[PDB]
Amino acid sequence: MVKVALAGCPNVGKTSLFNALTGTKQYVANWPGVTVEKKEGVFTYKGYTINLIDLPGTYSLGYSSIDEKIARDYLLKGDADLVILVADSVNPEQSLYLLLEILEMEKKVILAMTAIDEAKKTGMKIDRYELQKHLGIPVVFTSSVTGEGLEELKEKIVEYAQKNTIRMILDYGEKVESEIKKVENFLRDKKLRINPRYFALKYLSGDPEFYSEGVKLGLPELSEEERIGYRLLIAKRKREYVENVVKEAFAD
Ligand SMILES: Nc1nc2c(ncn2[C@@H]2O[C@H](COP(=O)(O)OP(=O)(O)NP(=O)(O)O)[C@@H](O)[C@H]2O)c(=O)[nH]1
Ligand SMILES: [Mg+2]
Ligand SMILES: [Mg+2]
Secondary structure, three states: OEEEEEEOOOOOOHHHHHHHHHOOOEEEEEOOOOOOEEEEEEEEEOOEEEEEEEOOOOOOOOOOOHHHHHHHHHHHHOOOOEEEEEEEOOOOHHHHHHHHHHHOOOOOEEEEEEOHHHHHOOOOEEOHHHHHHHHOOOEEEOOOOOOOOHHHHHHHHHHHHOOOOOOOOOOOOHHHHHHHHHHHHHOOOOOOOOOHHHHHHHHHOOOHHHHHHHHHOOOOOOOHHHHHHHHHHHHHHHHHHHHHHHHHHEEO
16 A cells, blocks of 8 residues: 655646546545645556645745644654645746755655646657766656656656655855755754754754754754754755756756
């Protein structure tokens, strides 16, 4: 039995892909403690039973808005074996930005470049090899309209699910990397439920959850100015990496 979460920005085609895979074998309930819909389904492939969770659309994984809280809580605290980042092939920048945040969690991720049927009609050339090179994860082109890639995606899910390990290591510059190392050193004995680098990034960025959990673990307070400053530098470096991936992997 394989549990997979579909993550992605608003309106990139998560549910269409979900439907294409599960058909009528799905149901809707609520996430615990709130009224927001949880959508879940199952399909069988080569005898495997693959359980699918269709997450709320999210541009980022902060901890202020209910969609982001739910998505992130599931990604960090749930029982998904792997994650499919559903990306809009025509307008991929926001998707790839979100992807970088998830890769930093050190989870197994497959990139599904969906609506490939619409993308190919622009004349654009998407180089799957260059995406794999720069993102370090399996990439599959999919269409919920034509069915392109759906079987390849199923194959990649089971192929990836069998591995005993997944690193997206983005250099944030001397200052941030220095502070990350300090945080990592300080937390060295603590029992964390996520890798210390991700923890450090969120604590430095003043994330409502990680900043508060960090302070509880003994980490010093940071000024509002500092937290805002780290948050912006981290976001900027992610944007720059996305720009570079798009330049290397996309052509007119
Ligand atoms: N051409 C094409 N259109 C697609 C494809 N997948 C989704 N769409 C279209 O994209 C729109 C958004 O699809 P949807 O599955 O609802 O996206 P979502 O990511 O689940 N949205 P949300 O974040 O609100 O939950 C719909 O109009 C859908 O028909 C695809 O593979 N090809
Ligand atoms: Mg929508
Ligand atoms: Mg949806």
